[PDB]
RNA sequence: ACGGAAACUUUCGUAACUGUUUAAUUCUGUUCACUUAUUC
């Protein structure tokens, strides 16, 4: 009737990425867009907005039936997984992500 | 050298007792700080 499925995993980075954050003040040697971190502490963290915006794009190009043009209006077979602000049959999404935090500080030092 | 002369409709007493503009309601549904790039 109503179940809760939590996909707990550990994202391992094999190659250093580069995602721009807010302002260019993460250190004393920046000149371009740095990396988003934590407003309280000083640990490089990755938000959850970049995961939904990238996984949906790479998935809607093989599981679709029509050439897309605008978001929330392509491939109805997967629109119920992320959401749709135009279809009256559903509005809320059934896939809630989470801002991944760096928990590798217990053995990095 | 008047059917006149003498004289408070006056004294007393809250329009009063009682009583929620109340019950119900996410300012949210879609959204990578991105694209091209030999520290040689």
UniProtKB/Swiss-Prot annotation:
Result for mutant: residue 99 to A: Nearly wild-type degradation of target ssRNA by the Csm complex, crRNA is shorter, Csm complex is altered
Highest taxon, organism lineage: Bacteria
Additional facts recorded: Encoded in a type III-A CRISPR locus.
Protein purpose: CRISPR (clustered regularly interspaced short palindromic repeat) is an adaptive immune system that provides protection against mobile genetic elements (viruses, transposable elements and conjugative plasmids). CRISPR clusters contain spacers, sequences complementary to antecedent mobile elements, and target invading nucleic acids. CRISPR clusters are transcribed and processed into CRISPR RNA (crRNA). Csm functions as a non-specific ssDNase. Base-pairing between crRNA and target RNA to form a ternary Csm complex activates a ssDNase activity; target RNA cleavage suppresses the ssDNase, a temporal control that prevents uncontrolled DNA degradation. Viral RNA transcripts probably tether the Csm complex to the viral genome, recruiting Cas10 ssDNA activity which is able to degrade DNA in the transcription bubble, spatially controlling the DNase activity.
Subunit-level organization: Part of the Csm effector complex that includes at least Cas10(1), Csm2(3), Csm3(5), Csm4(1), Csm5(1) and mature crRNA. The Csm complex is elongated and slightly twisted with a maximal length of 215 Angstroms and a diameter of 75-80 Angstroms. It has been modeled to have a central protein filamant of Csm3 subunits along which the dsRNA helix of paired crRNA and target RNA binds. The filament is capped at one end by Cas10 and Csm4 and at the other end by Csm5; ssDNA is thought to bind to the N-terminal HD domain of Cas10.
Family per record: Belongs to the CRISPR-associated Csm3 family.
Official protein name in the record: CRISPR system Cms endoribonuclease Csm3
Organism, as annotated: Streptococcus thermophilus
Chain's gene name: csm3
């Amino acid at each position: 009737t109503f179940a809760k499925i939590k996909f707990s995993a550990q994202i391992r980075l094999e190659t250093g990425l580069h995602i721009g954050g807010s302002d260019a003040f993460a250190a004393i040697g920046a000149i371009d867009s740095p990396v988003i971190k934590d407003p309280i502490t000083n640990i490089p963290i990755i938000p959850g907005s970049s995961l939904k915006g990238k996984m949906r794009t790479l998935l809607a190009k093989v599981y679709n039936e029509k050439v897309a043009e605008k978001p929330s209006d392509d491939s109805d077979i997967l629109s119920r997984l992320f959401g749709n602000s135009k279809d009256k049959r559903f509005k809320m999404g059934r896939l809630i992500f989470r801002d991944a935090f760096l928990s590798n500080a217990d053995e990095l030092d």
